[PDB]
Design a protein around this ligand. Sequence first.
Ligand code: LGC
Length: 475
Amino acid sequence: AIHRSDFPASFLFGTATSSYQIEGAYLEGNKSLSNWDVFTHLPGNIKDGSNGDIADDHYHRYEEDVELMNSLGVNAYRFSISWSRILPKGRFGGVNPAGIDFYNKLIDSILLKGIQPFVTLTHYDIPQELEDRYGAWLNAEIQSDFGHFADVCFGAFGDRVKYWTTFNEPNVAVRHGYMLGTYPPSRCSPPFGHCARGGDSHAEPYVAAHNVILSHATAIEIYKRKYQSKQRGMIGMVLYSTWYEPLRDVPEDRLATERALAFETPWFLDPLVYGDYPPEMRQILGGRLPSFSPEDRRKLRYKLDFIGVNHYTTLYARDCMFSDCPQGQETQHALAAVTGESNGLPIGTPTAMPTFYVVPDGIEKMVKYFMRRYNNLPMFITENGYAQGGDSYTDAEDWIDDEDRIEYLEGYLTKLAKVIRDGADVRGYFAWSVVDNFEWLFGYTLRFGLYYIDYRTQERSPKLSALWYKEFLQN
Ligand SMILES: O=C1O[C@H](CO)[C@@H](O)[C@H](O)[C@H]1O
């Protein structure tokens, strides 16, 4: 149904990964322990009790993985840099040459094949030491650490990397980390949970996000002042971008839907484009959102060059401002509740990932939302994809037969081509993921890969979707 020629000639087509999810070699090459290294070695977090110690062993097997990408005919590869490999002890601890060597080699390998790097600086991970020293995202000192990390990466890799992302989905990592307490540093308060470390779900998430925003701003000021004229790259931020529809087509649910949307990606994007938090958020939260100082605002004038759209699913949103809803959900402060069902019918075909339904026109609608809110600022679809999991899969053959993933990709790509024809400045698409990998709290129980991985042997095998994507990219 959909073909390569239905997109612009210079469109990026790739796959996406992150460092913790694929690399393994978690203590090799002088790398320090990350937050997720520490987290996954505690009980009661990961569904299958697994960790990222080995994962896909991409640290040793990167060249095979680059060859697999190449055989699909991708022209780009989205990956993240492990902060703990570059600056194991943060900014006063010295640059780790072994980390620099690993990423240089990876970048050179993909460029040899004509595959453009599309690099995420941080994707959920930090050196544990930054948490231990000053509480990471709860202290403004993180801005300087992140600034320095960014500066090192730009200086070492930026001659060959033309697309950078500061953060992957800080909307998810912050709320999970500081509101629900389900991600490290596992902080929360009632009614979201009882976290033994402590926390304040009504305050700390907004402090953390504040420092993420300003870490971005510090990094992009560094890039534009120091590196941009020589390196000629673009610096963006990636946000988790779910589309929301009103549960009932009435004003209170429409308004609730607008709130749900505004509390997600504009939480970060409004400050980065307009220099203030979303007014939808400010109206409800007031002083819980910290202020931007004159110094902050100076950095915020560098803004961002693109929006990284991680879009998977679409949900219904309903009002909680004038109805009493269950408390302790991540949408609590937005005074909306979200669901995938209306009247015993799901919004689209359910999948093995909770909240992920097959709703292709969500990607069109999400892109148009960005277009209108941010005056068609350039966008990249930095993640889109489909999970297999559960009882139905006992052997390799079951995982390889992924006509369901093919149908997802075809539907979403069809709607993406449509929104671009309709004027959206979308410039690429990255399928999550090239390989099955460690799916955070789900461990290895969810498989998003175009390639199946046997974790006993590390054997890579193409699923039908790998063959499909190859055929699509051949036109
Ligand atoms: O949005 C995402 O979706 C992926 C699937 O849940 C996950 O693996 C990535 O790390 C995350 O960036």
